[PDB]
């Protein structure tokens, strides 16, 4: 439960604090925690594995719709709407999280 | 578009050069991943994988080989180590950028991951190379070789080197095995063999074993430290052989086991015991060499000198047992094989002597008057020796004879001491043997009871001491001499005889006059209390008739066997007690009454097996064994009508070995006698098979 | 002069043993035969 | 509809520990007495920082082992009393 409590606190940092990293997938500047992102593997390789480490971040690629759900998942482990599924799968291929890929596949199977 | 992926691949590959080189910046990782991400989606991810492999190989060939070759002169290991660290670092970071390919295309194409691929390239272009590997292997051999000599070397470098080989081996360890592992084992092997050859010059067992044990610890350390455990296990086996197996028996005779046995060096033997405990058949060769010595020493003890004191003979063997028992307790750590070795050794030389049972029957000397606990342990040791003996029946007969003597003379320290010996005999023998001894005790209970009954009879009707003997239980001269008895004692014995006839119906009184003495008086200048055999008593009675009595003359009237009339030679004995020749007994020897004999105490007892006795006693043993097996064979032949000769002799000897080992050749003769006496009947199908005939 | 005193007579008394059956029990004991009417 | 969820992040917390082992992205460095780099994000979440988030941010080398370990994965009793953490309190009481 300690890891879960720590996790809850990490995202609560929801308090507009420690949001050193700023993701940009479509010109829009959304905020995120660099170290916390480096715990979840595109982000892991974005900073710790990144060479220009100077990303505190232009993801570009997929749209924010999918990325918003991707971020909504990496925080509090909660992903996936009927209108927001295929793009999330594509975004789940950019970020190394198969959970979202699996989730979208099951959702597509369902609908 | 193929040109688009080509251009984006070039950008990614140019950035890959950066990720691979020490400098790592000047680019946005996201772009790089995007390149790889799009390429995989554009069916060019595997194309990128091959290109990545190409630059990885190029780096490990152009930016590595030359660098480590510049260090062939010196610090090759350190330069190679640094290159390996740099390579591994480059592999993980390029992987953390080309991860998407491993995520899908690498597992799809069923190929290895970026890092795995990089390591394979390294163990093909750098490590495990045509020359670089050998340079590393030899320098590691040189490193451990100096470590073997004690030369302080950088064990960290050796450890890093071997560990690096393990990492290159990945899932397997073949890389290290085919790089330094196998060379190290053979190099260490000759290292120990040279050490053992150098030791062969010292020719001293103790220091050899001590430093060998130290070598085991020191060498195994050199391994678990910088050579890990993969090479340690083989070493534990290699060093043990190249250092000890070659001298498995050499160390035994090099100080030495027998040297330790002679000086009772239990501490040195303990080290040798442990040294060969970890050696296959190491204890075996030590045991057989020890048994060889124990055989020699025990045979020397068994070998008679003149004949040797039965007490000393048994005690010598008891002392021999105690020494090796302590050796097993300490040096051989109660090893079961060593125990079995010593046990068989004693069972061997002990039986070589047929007088061993007679000599052990030692027990009589102990029973014939240390504390009770010390005596108990002495009896126990003799019992342990009795266990080694196979002549159980012979010992029982010899002991029961001595027991009967002590019982008749009622001089045993305590019947309880006898009871204990009898109980111990029962544990190591049959109830038959015990019943004989038990019956002897019952007889004594009757004798003392009947004696008082006769005294009560004397009081009722208003110093004879009859000792009734139970038939069988007590062995007696096949033929009682039936000599005349002094009238007063004889008349009194007739009264006890008629008393016993009435008291015990269907029971006679065969007087064994030869057994028993009396308080005979004799003129001495005054009389004295002389303890003489009933035979010597009748002689003095003749002296009452005639002061001058000749050997033959006394026989003509006492009716005593000329040999037993012994009595006259003992009575004369040496003319103090009686004047006869001083000791030699002959017919022409006339005996004159002697009064010169004297003593401070009025009571003076008068002195009263040899080759003849021992011979007849052993013959009795043989005759008993003869009838014994004959009965046993018929008994089982009756139980199992059909019994094949070999089967019959096998089961018979097996069921009888407990008390004695029946000789099969004589068994067959007795078996043939049983065949003649109906019973065994040779079958037409197999004469060996015998059918029982009531 | 030489008169015997306190004579320790030793007389082996004898029947004046287990029957074949028992010989081939000890508890069993002896027209006298060792071990429903007397024969 | 069926928005599927998975709390496998419990490799988020694991990665932060490996990030610490890798000695990378250490936003802050704790001056034990000696220095020991740490991550304020975990520290603030594990114990309420108030301190780091309370701008107490001007101190890159904030001046101060059993606690930090537990976070990513006699004196401990005193530290737990000073900085109230129920899990550490229970663990030290059990020990």
Residue numbers in the entry:
A (entry chain K): 31 to 43, 45 to 71, 73 to 84, 86 to 89, 91 to 113, 115 to 146
B (entry chain C): 26 to 279, 282 to 333, 335 to 389, 391 to 398, 403 to 495, 502 to 564, 588 to 627, 629 to 636, ...
C (entry chain R): 21 to 36, 51 to 58, 65 to 70, 77 to 81, 92 to 95
D (entry chain L): 24 to 33, 35 to 57, 59 to 73, 75, 77 to 83, 86 to 93, 102 to 110, 121 to 142
Reproduce passages from the article.
Among these, Cullin-RING E3 ubiquitin ligases (CRLs) stand out as multi-subunit complexes comprising the Cullin scaffold subunit, an adapter subunit, a substrate receptor subunit, as well as an E2-recruiting subunit RBX1/22,3. The ubiquitin ligase function of CRL3s is activated through dimerization. In contrast, the BTB-containing Kelch-like protein 22 (KLHL22) plays important roles in mitosis, T-cell activity and amino acid sensing. CRL3KLHL22 ubiquitylates several cellular substrates, including serine/threonine-protein kinase PLK1, programmed cell death protein 1 (PD1), and DEP domain-containing protein 5 (DEPDC5).
To investigate the role of the CUL3 NA motif in the assembly of CRL3KLHL22, we generated two truncated mutants: CUL3Δ1–24, in which the NA motif was deleted entirely, and a partial deletion mutant CUL3Δ1–13, which was expected to impair the interaction between CUL3 and the domain swapping β-sheet of KLHL22. To provide further evidence that deletion of the CUL3 NA motif impairs assembly of CRL3KLHL22, we resolved the cryo-EM structure of the CUL3Δ1–24-RBX1-KLHL221–178 with 3.9 Å resolution. Rigid body-fitting of the CUL3Δ1–24-RBX1 and KLHL221–178 structure confirms that the complex contains one dimeric KLHL221–178 and one CUL3Δ1–24-RBX1. We also found that about 6% (5070/79349) of particles exist as dimer states, suggesting that the KLHL22 dimer can also recruit two CUL3Δ1–24-RBX1 molecules. We speculate that the CUL3Δ1–24-RBX1-KLHL221–178 may exist in a state of dynamic equilibrium between the (CUL3Δ1–24-RBX1)2-(KLHL221–178)2 state and the (CUL3Δ1–24-RBX1)1-(KLHL221–178)2 state, with the equilibrium favoring the formation of (CUL3Δ1–24-RBX1)1-(KLHL221–178)2 due to decreased binding affinity between KLHL22 and CUL3Δ1–24-RBX1. The results showed that CUL3 binds to KLHL221–178 with a binding affinity of approximately 27 nM, while CUL3Δ1–13 and CUL3Δ1–24 bind to KLHL221–178 with binding affinities of approximately 87 nM and 383 nM, respectively. The SEC-MALS analysis of CUL3WT-RBX1-KLHL221–178 showed a molecular weight of 241 kDa, which is consistent with a dimeric complex (calculated molecular weight 245 kDa, of one dimeric KLHL221–178 binding with two CUL3WT-RBX1). However, The SEC-MALS analysis of the CUL3Δ1–24-RBX1-KLHL221–178 showed two protein peaks. The first indicated a molecular weight of 155 kDa, which corresponds to one dimeric KLHL221–178 (calculated molecular weight 41 kDa) binding with one CUL3Δ1–24-RBX1 (calculated molecular weight 100 kDa).
